[PDB]
A paper describes a structure:
We show, through ligand complexes with products and sialidase inhibitors, that the 3-D structure and active center are indeed an unusual arrangement, with family-conserved histidine and aspartate residues defining the catalytic mechanism that acts with inversion of anomeric configuration; facets not previously observed in the canon of literature for sialidases. The catalytic domain (residues 6–376) comprises a complete (β/α)8-barrel fold while the C-terminal domain (residues 377–502) consists of an eight-stranded β-sandwich.
Thus, Asp14 is the most likely candidate to act as a general catalytic base residue (discussed further below). Asp14 is ideally placed to assume the role of general base, through its position on the “beta” face and its direct interaction with the product OH in the Neu5Ac complex. When overlaying this structure with that of EnvSia156Neu5Ac it is possible to speculate that a similar process occurs, with the carboxylate held in a pseudo-equatorial orientation by Arg129, Arg202, and Asn346, and the aglycone fitting into the pocket formed by Trp164, Phe203, Phe278, and Trp279, forcing the glycosidic bond into a pseudo-axial orientation.
Author numbering:
A (entry chain B): 6 to 432, 434 to 502
B (entry chain A): 6 to 431, 434 to 502
The structure:
């Protein structure tokens, strides 16, 4: 009954369908694959710094575009030859659609309602893809002409250094112009403010004033949609994506508790940025913080699954690891599982054959129950500027020392197998090199485990967990080593 | 005004007054130094594994004691000769009080009320000092005879490994026996459950069931005190010390939000363990979590001030650093500043001459305003088992890389001087660092000669444009032209 919110990005559909002259019927058929699943809402993203539809107030993706021209034309000149082919796939498909009088978002919204899906618009509030390239096709002329409106002018270390400063009147107006058009153009059930693209909206040190500013912004949005409710003849929801921990959220100027209490939002998505999906997010704390407000709390998953920030592995979640994350987060009180970057091609799970099963299982503890799952230890990629960072992995154990790892494994396991699995980096061990306990109970050595993707590129050792040791929620791996060891991976595999 | 809660520990008074035959009058005079200050409550701790008063349900500190005997006697045999002198100071003074018919806690409670101080009892729920020594004088016989009731039987790496497991009925009963006695023996305004001595109460991995167990415990205590309200003819408060961050609190089986919502507690003290004061605690998050519950949220200071867990420096807070922490935590919404280990001698601020001034200033932003203060970067000493730890220092900056440190400096500074000061561990010039605060370039000042507490490595000062500083967090950003390791960071605000 919690169900899935699925986010469709502003570029994917155009990139993957490029080269086809799309009919209204084919455009509609994209919604259909999500019909009869646990998907309750599609969050349709129509923009980055530019829109993928023919905006009157912002730059469409195709502003500057020469449809008949060569790839080497001014709009694409800044990219290498090979990347112009991909960018032009997006620009051209978005352009051609408009030329045929097909508004892709209007069609998706209409088809959503026919298929019992609640259609949302999700706006990227501060996308900064490729801002190292000032000439790049997908920057707004407004961004290009106004470097004084940026967040960090004293350095350029990260893309977010060149993000818009929402402390400025003219930055808020620029984003409110697009919202006023989206509300007028599209008859959506809900608007989501996607603050987590890229989650950095304020001069470093100005986040507290930023918090009062985004609350007022959110209130302007809520007021505007209230007017549209009387016009459309139905309720319109307002939602937001925010960081995964309340202190990080408040530290980036997102006081979601105030937004909830003053009735500005009725859905909140707690999410990482992109580096890895968080398999561990303090859902129960947010639920306490949001008590009485009537806000739907969604737990946001990302497609990547990576053990630590500096890992060179860039593999996606599998059905089994999404089953783990989803079982965990629903067990903690998530009222929705929200998928970001889990699309039907290119930006999607590596085991794409499992996409339909995933959409029919991860939205309920009932449909996850008795199915194989993996609870993998990862990390929170997003922290407020100068906020101390708590990153579990990698973890050194010196001879005779103890290390502990708490992994959230949601519902108590049904009868069957539980393996605590630990990856060791740097080249190794015997059957008595490690002592492994779970909630204090000794775990028997199993030997090397042949993991399916996602998996580390170093040996993973399995330890058999006495079924009855496992408890609902967090479960504690403790390890001591007789030799210095570095851990690069931890998970629970539960196969009932 | 928010005001001060001050904790007197179970041993201090006995250790420091040892060798004097104490009169009822002198015992009473201890309360007097706190009268007419911002202290609203004295939290009088009467126990560890043993009581400092003559309990009939627990071991007094002097169980086993031979008053006329030599230092080398069975009760103290396990200590080296010179440590028996200190321990025996505590045991003998506590014993001799009882022999004179002086109940120190009954006298303190009475004298508190005469002097307009609200008197509390603060019970250590699981003290584990010196549990490496199974024959130690301060361990209870119950603890000694029941090693099966301990938290960790598979290893002994930390004192908390030999803490009692409150997952056991026998452990809960044992601690409830003392609470039943304290409620009957003493007419206190409030009982505080000091969970933060030592904050580890459950088998590793059983903290969730632990949370339901301490809620039921706390509720049992609340029901007990409700009965005593009708006998004593006045309200009795129930309070608790808990970890500084909500996730850590819930992770150690302390669901204080439930305790607050069900009206089991009406005071909560967020605090670190002992390694250092936390100058940065999520007060505003707790206030949101506690909204409508009527619970007073107290921000707990510890006496030590240390930049990171492995630092060999063990210096205390000064008047100036306590002013900084207090200005910060009050600014964030603390309804009380709570002092732990800020006593009148031995366990005390090293600038002891400033103790009376401290007790008249740190309870109100009004009395802190326009006074010199230091906002020092530290760390949270306490994390749930296997919980990822966020420790800011020490911090390496590679050539051409940026590091940031957010320090909470509470109220925006008055007219005067603001210095960002950065300590370098393990050779720099005036351009080796670029330092910004909230993006504004800060002038190199050179080496700053800090007063204690201070690192044993060079501290460089950077002049902050007064107007850059904001209310609450303020952001130091630094880039280095040479590989450097920071061991220290602070704001000095001198109006
Ligand atoms: C690289 C690619 O093809 N698509 C990517 C898009 C585009 O970069 C973006 O939509 C341009 O506006 O961004 C994401 O959705 C994102 O932000 O997480 C990830 C996705 O993989
Ligand atoms: C002289 C001395 O060491 N006293 C210390 C006492 C005793 O060790 C304890 O009361 C034994 O029961 O403990 C503390 O208050 C504590 O827990 O932080 C600190 C204080 O410095």
């Amino acid at each position: 009954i919690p169900g899935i919110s699925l986010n469709e990005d502003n570029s994917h559909y155009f990139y993957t369908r490029a080269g086809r002259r799309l009919s209204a019927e084919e455009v509609d058929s994209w919604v259909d694959q999500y019909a009869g699943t646990q998907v309750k809402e599609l969050m349709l993203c129509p923009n980055c710094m530019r829109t993928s539809y023919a905006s009157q107030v912002w730059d469409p993706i195709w502003r500057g575009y020469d449809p008949a021209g060569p790839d080497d034309q001014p709009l694409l000149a800044s990219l290498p030859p090979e990347e112009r082919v991909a960018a032009r796939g997006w620009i051209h498909t978005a352009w051609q659609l408009h030329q045929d009088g097909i508004d892709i978002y209007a069609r998706w919204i209409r088809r959503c309602r026919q298929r019992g899906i609640s259609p949302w618009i999700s706006m990227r509030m501060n996308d900064v893809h490729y801002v190292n390239d000032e000439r790049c096709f997908l920057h707004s002329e407004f961004w290009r002409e106004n470097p004084q409106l940026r967040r960090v002018p004293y350095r350029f270390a990260e893309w977010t250094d060149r993000a818009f400063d929402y402390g400025r009147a003219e930055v808020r107006e620029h984003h409110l112009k697009l919202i006023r058009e989206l509300a007028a153009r599209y008859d959506f059930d809900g608007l989501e403010l996607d603050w987590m693209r890229f989650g950095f909206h304020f001069r470093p040190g100005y986040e507290a004033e930023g918090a009062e500013i985004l609350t007022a912004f959110t209130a302007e949005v809520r007021r505007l949609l209230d007017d549209w409710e009387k016009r459309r003849g139905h309720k319109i929801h307002l939602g937001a994506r925010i960081p995964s921990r309340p202190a990080t959220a408040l530290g980036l100027g997102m006081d979601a508790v105030t937004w909830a209490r003053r009735g500005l939002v009725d859905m909140l998505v707690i999410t990482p940025f992109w580096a890895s999906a968080e398999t561990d997010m303090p859902v129960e704390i947010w639920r306490q913080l949001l008590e009485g407000t009537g806000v739907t709390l969604a737990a946001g998953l990302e497609v990547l699954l990576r053990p630590y920030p500096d890992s060179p592995l860039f593999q996606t979640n599998s059905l089994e690891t999404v089953r783990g994350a989803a079982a965990s987060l629903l067990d903690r009180g998530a009222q929705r599982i929200y998928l970001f970057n889990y699309m039907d091609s290119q930006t999607a799970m590596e085991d794409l054959e499992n996409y339909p099963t995933l959409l029919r299982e991860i939205g309920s503890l009932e449909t996850l129950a008795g199915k194989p799952r993996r609870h993998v230890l990862t990390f929170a990629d997003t922290w407020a500027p100068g906020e101390p960072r708590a990153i579990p992995l990698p973890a050194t154990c010196r001879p005779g020392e103890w290390r502990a790892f708490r992994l959230h494994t949601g519902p108590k396991p049904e009868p069957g197998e539980v393996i605590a699995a630990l990856g060791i980096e740097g080249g190794a061990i015997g059957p008595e090199t490690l002592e492994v306990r779970v909630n204090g109970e000794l775990c028997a050595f199993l030997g090397l485990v042949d993991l399916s993707k996602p998996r580390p590129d170093f040996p993973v050792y399995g330890f058999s967990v006495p079924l009855a040791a496992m408890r609902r929620g967090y479960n504690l791996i403790e390890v001591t080593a007789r030799q210095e060891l570095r851990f690069g991976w931890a998970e629970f595999l539960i196969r009932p």
